[PDB]
Design a protein around this nucleic acid. Sequence first.
DNA 1: ATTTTGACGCT
Length: 430
Amino acid sequence: GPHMATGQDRVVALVDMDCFFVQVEQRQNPHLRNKPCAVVQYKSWKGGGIIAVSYEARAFGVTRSMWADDAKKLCPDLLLAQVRESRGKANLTKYREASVEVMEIMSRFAVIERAAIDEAYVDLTSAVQERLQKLQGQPISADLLPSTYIEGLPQGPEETVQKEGMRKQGLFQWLDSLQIDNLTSPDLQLTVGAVIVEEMRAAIERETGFQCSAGISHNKVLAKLACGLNKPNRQTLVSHGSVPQLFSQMPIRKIRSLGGKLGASVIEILGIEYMGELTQFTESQLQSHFGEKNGSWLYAMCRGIEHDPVKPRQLPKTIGCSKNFPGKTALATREQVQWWLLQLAQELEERLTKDRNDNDRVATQLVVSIRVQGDKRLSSLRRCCALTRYDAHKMSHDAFTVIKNCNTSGTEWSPPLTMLFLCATKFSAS
DNA sequence: ATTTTGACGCT
Ligand SMILES: Nc1ncnc2c1ncn2[C@H]1C[C@H](O)[C@@H](COP(=O)(O)NP(=O)(O)OP(=O)(O)O)O1
Ligand SMILES: [Mg+2]
Ligand SMILES: [Mg+2]
């Protein structure tokens, strides 16, 4: 009752760019705009692997991971943009730079946590309070929320058969219900949050050309879930009160961190399917099956409560370069391994030097990882060494030194290598 | 022959 926390202390948003790499390429090449389009890496093997897909192309069934030749079978007029290739490998520089454009705009509004190349969490609690002070008891107009969905609404009793009609009906129900004169109301706080996110999304689109979606809720997991509910080019507010119905038919795997083995174990061990069913277990029961930390997290999360903070971190903490060498292309000679380590080290040097100039920091550890043919794990082996100079020849030599004894017998390398990976870590200020 | 990443947990 009066002491049961409800996880309504924060306003958190998650902003995720729509078909991000595709929009970067469509901005660059107007011929690709408003077309079924995908971004592909490499080309020789089955036309290249698709890594991003426009919504027009998704309507034909094109998905990430599809070979371009196969996507063309579903969508004969599919247009393609290729990732830059440098030193024999895919180069993602253009997308990292476009990401910085977006993150720098978002950081004008609030502290952000860069969660991936095209998404960031925003802690809006302070900004909402300031905005509530600015507009004392002044009602919030639907005009301030032109792209917002209120999850769960409309409810109860032709304008109801088009999606914009439904969107506005739900928004009207929500705003009609609001208590505008209490500045401590969580639902009001979320609504002001959504007004700010509309402003943020408009700024991103104005200043970059890129569209995005967003979720606004009281924590990162609900914000992330909300964001996906009405992609693309829309934002969704998930209130605390919307959680029971939302979670009552929500597959466990849809919640952040439960899409893999742990989520599968929750389903198998407890014999449930939906996130809401978790409420019927005690905290101790969940801790007994999934550990103290996971158990406590699940117990709170199924009630819509999560405390993971929006970390103040706009820049990646590691800078890595990797290449797979699948099937017959697996690396089988010492010279091959050394040449590709050099290629990777040269890209890494270029990125590290730019990073040192832009961000006043230096990496101090080099992690070298390899995969051997047959091992299904991403990494078969990981070894580190000191990273003392931004020099590609030195980094490649040091990586070879730290992995060379993985070679059962050689001039020859065995078993063949299916992946090389260099990652610069442990940054210190410079 | 899905590729190239990046954050974080466990021991
Ligand atoms: N498995 C993968 N391998 C490589 N790159 C990938 C990837 N998954 C995504 N990317 C790259 C390419 C993606 O453009 C970018 C962002 O990933 P999303 O936010 O998950 N997907 P997007 O923004 O395209 O569409 P949506 O509107 O549904 O958000 O990261
Ligand atoms: Mg995206
Ligand atoms: Mg994303």
